[PDB]
Symmetry: D2
Subunit: 253 residues, 4 copies
């Protein structure tokens, strides 16, 4: 049986590495993207050449706004999950990785309204709707036909408890995502859907403060953790957030 | 004579916080959404005990636009803070207490639920804090108050999620992130930002589950903590969430 | 007139806690280990303000047996609580404040390791356990009609142990043990209405035995005020937690750190 | 080629499963035991039959007490001897798993109290400290050119200690101390590239010395599967954390509890 994984913001960096790691384990992968069309399609071509019909790409703005055919964020999220079912007839793994990240200072408007909707949508609201859509499809599937290893991974932040100066909305959205991890893990446990979090510290910086190695991590150093959590060997883990930060959160100023 | 703005001040914990602050000498701006009668009765009581010591202001704190060019949530939040400056010339304390609470099970009405639960519990508090901070920054150093304090009403039990309340749980998680991020960024202006998290308070069985006293708390048992945190004796406390739950979070199923 | 037992009450935070409780009307038992002169001067001050409102008791709270059959740590702890009952007939509040603090780096000197372990663990964790146990037994043995109406135990923790200080492993471990004691005791003593909370300072009355610039550098790291706290800024929190207005709070650790734990390197 | 792992309390249950899991990955394993001599030797025989000279056994009481050999043997010396056994036999020690642990009630409400404190604290916290110290020293004393490339220490913690089990104060305190050791050691040993993490079970291979309905009632509370875990469900996590794929993870505690810590009464 060939399982299916949906990875948001899969075009580059950590998302690409997660998609590659899952693919290497045998998963068919739905690569979501927003603006990185070229990169997403190049990645899909690579994976499809390795193994035919093992990758597809889907586009969506995950910000909490209405788009042009007006389509709500929920519908767009449900359509992402539906794309996996339409093409492969299943969705076993969901990785909420897509995320906007920029300053929203509290001390010195439309730019602030799109910032709020963008940072909250990508990091928290979209993951909620995606989890909701993912869960309904599992519930609507007769018990004898269900997969045996459902797993949802939310990409969190090991450092949000030590907030980055000027990134309040981002920090708040990651906090929301932690609560989603715990609430979904509890509510979806009856359907045997596990929900966990992976929180990087400093990964693939475009440094000397990280206790372990005095460097940021590679994409694999994070993605390998995600892949392990999706494996059947991790089937008793749920509702937990795993830090992959080389001890950075243990530091103080 | 200092000024305090309390959201959702009409009854229960909001009313007790407003009463507690008033007893300490504060002039209080009592915000309300639908409880006009209860808010005005409370204002009358406080004004009778001390003239010009209470006012009432109305606002929907949900993350939606209202009719007067439609009015955004931010504008309504800035107007709440401005009401304090227009009437008394100051705002020393902000208590984010207003909160919607109802189920959003994972297994059009979901659009207003999202905006309502997220707005009241997280987005409105963000904008209110932003407006509060701007008014302090725009005040010349010599005229500034000497005890600025913001209290966010959180939940001691969200880490042990209530089944079916995902959006609420997520929003409280966002509110905790706001507490830490705001405390760090507003520290230079000496504005303290803390949280108070009830467990079970003023309940409409479950009571017998609370280790301490085997009952839910009274409104005062929570509000007295809030008042202490606003006092100058608590001036070195910032960015921390204080549980007022009688040991409920120490329990397991 | 209620009674408070404060360990390591001779100076700094302990002294301020003792003063704060005394100002609220409490009679105070001031424990000390090596600061006899300071403890007795403090007792004299409190007794002058209000007669028979202070006493002093000496004890090594390290996890070792002392010369009288040797005297165990438990017996010494029970004796501390008993001193309050012998003199005033009650003990309403216990503040576990006494604490040793020095390096135990992981990277005829067996004496130093054996004694460091017993000292840092005893003062910060084991003695607090035995003290709480003795405190709880005295309340349980009191007929419900004679019991006080506001029992409160405060454990002095550390807001920064989750971001460990380099080279202080045993200290950090002991403070972790103290957090577990706070939670476990709060749950088990709830039926007797004994509340158990923690207060965790960040940087308070920072010792200045170093160059001025290095000292100013350390406190400048604290987000709120860019300084370490005063003893009162911490003790006032402890007093509030013991007040009847805080009667629904139990099993919680309150940080008094000016946002220091929110920082990263 | 051919790394070495030291696992305390390796004779049965989780410890055995961790030892088996590491052995299956290619590790040579030093199986520590206290009272389970027969079980430990049977396990060693199985592993050695599967791959010659791939398992040894060493005995030690990890309680914080001195033992009779001229002078009495301290806990530290016994801990250093455990690590030394690995170097004497195989010339290396890449992985240390602090799994051994005593667990029984210490209610708040003579020789029994003194030995419980030393036993529960020694096995769960103090021995792990000394073991880590000895492990770290052997790495530091090794020339850089000769050192292993994947050092990893795993401390077996408890996912449920923040929701204390009624009447287990000393155990809960010791597990709290163990969490502090995890963070402190991770920070101090980072320069030597020694990773220190924790794995916290909820309910695993739950002991059943009680009416069947009571047993069923307890495990039914775990949200995921409504049952306690198998030993493998925990040990597989430990093995992953020791793998080179987990080399950026340090100072973190991973719950393996099926969502049990998410529950409330
Ligand atoms: N890298 C780190 O040091 C670090 C640290 C802590 C946490 N994290 C978390 O780890 C995850 C991945 O990290 P990363 O650094 O690889 O992320 P990233 O490069 O910053 O962004 C990942 C992808 O998210 C997508 N995205 C952003 N806004 C979107 C929106 N409005 N709608 C739809 N997609 C949107 C983008 O897709 P397109 O390019 O296609 O537009 C982007 O490529 C994130 O959740 C992040 O928060 C990373
Ligand atoms: N009570 C508890 O056991 C408990 C437990 C955990 C946390 N808390 C937190 O403590 C705080 C107070 O608790 P509570 O029980 O007193 O709260 P509550 O009675 O449920 O509600 C407080 C007020 O919030 C206002 N509100 C709700 N939605 C609003 C919106 N869309 N816009 C503007 N105002 C809105 C309402 O004002 P109007 O009546 O005027 O419409 C309501 O009176 C809340 O933040 C709550 O989350 C309470
Ligand atoms: N100050 C800070 O920045 C800071 C930061 C974090 C946490 N804390 C916690 O807050 C509490 C008080 O802080 P502090 O700085 O005021 O403490 P401190 O000055 O270092 O010490 C308080 C007292 O502990 C007593 N003590 C030490 N070892 C003892 C032992 N073996 N037996 C009996 N008593 C012993 C000493 O009493 P004698 O003088 O009589 O010998 C000492 O005066 C401590 O628990 C500490 O861990 C403080
Ligand atoms: N099983 C669970 O549901 C659970 C839950 C939470 C945490 N944990 C943690 O996971 C780890 C393993 O769990 P487990 O249930 O497998 O443990 P366990 O069966 O209770 O005990 C493991 C071993 O510890 C050794 N031990 C006890 N006291 C000792 C001492 N004084 N000196 C030396 N060795 C001593 C014993 O070795 P001998 O038999 O040779 O005497 C025993 O076999 C423990 O650290 C435990 O705290 C387990
Ligand atoms: C720069 C910062 O310290 C750190 O590397 C982070 N980067 C990112 C992040 N989140 C996103 N979406 N993208 C990033 O590049 N969280 C933390
Ligand atoms: C029973 C329930 O869990 C508890 O009383 C809570 N009530 C409320 C809450 N939040 C709000 N806004 N209102 C409540 O009545 N959080 C928790
Ligand atoms: C020096 C350190 O950074 C901090 O101010 C602390 N001081 C002390 C402490 N504990 C004790 N007993 N004494 C201190 O002076 N814990 C933390
Ligand atoms: C019974 C209890 O709820 C749980 O299964 C635990 N068991 C054990 C434990 N720790 C040890 N050493 N042994 C156990 O059997 N911690 C928690």
């Amino acid at each position: 049986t060939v399982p299916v994984a949906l990875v948001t913001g899969a075009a580059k960096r950590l998302g690409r590495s997660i998609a590659e790691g899952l693919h290497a384990e045998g998963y068919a992968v739905c690569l979501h993207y927003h603006r990185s069309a070229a990169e997403a399609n190049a990645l899909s071509a690579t994976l499809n050449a390795r193994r035919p019909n093992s990758a597809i790409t889907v586009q969506a703005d995950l910000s909490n706004v209405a788009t042009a055919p007006p389509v709500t964020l929920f519908t767009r999220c449900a359509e992402l999950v539906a794309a996996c079912y339409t093409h492969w007839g299943r969705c076993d793994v969901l990785v909420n990785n897509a995320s906007s990240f920029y300053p929203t200072p509290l001390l010195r408007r439309e730019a602030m309204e799109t910032a709020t909707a963008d940072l909250f949508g990508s990091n928290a609201i979209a993951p909620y709707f995606l989890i909701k859509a993912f869960a309904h499809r599992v519930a609507g599937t007769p018990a004898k036909h269900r997969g045996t290893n459902y797993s949802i991974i939310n990409m969190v932040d090991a450092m949000t408890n030590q907030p980055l100066l000027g990134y309040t909305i981002y920090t708040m959205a990651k906090g929301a995502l932690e609560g989603l991890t715990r609430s979904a893990a509890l509510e979806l446990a009856p359907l045997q859907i596990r929900v966990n979090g992976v929180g990087p510290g400093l990964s693939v910086l475009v440094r000397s403060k990280v206790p372990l190695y005095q460097r940021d991590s590679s994409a694999a150093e994070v993605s390998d953790v995600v892949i392990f959590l999706c494996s059947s060997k991790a089937k008793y883990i749920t509702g937990t957030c795993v830090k992959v930060d080389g001890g950075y959160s243990l530091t103080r100023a």
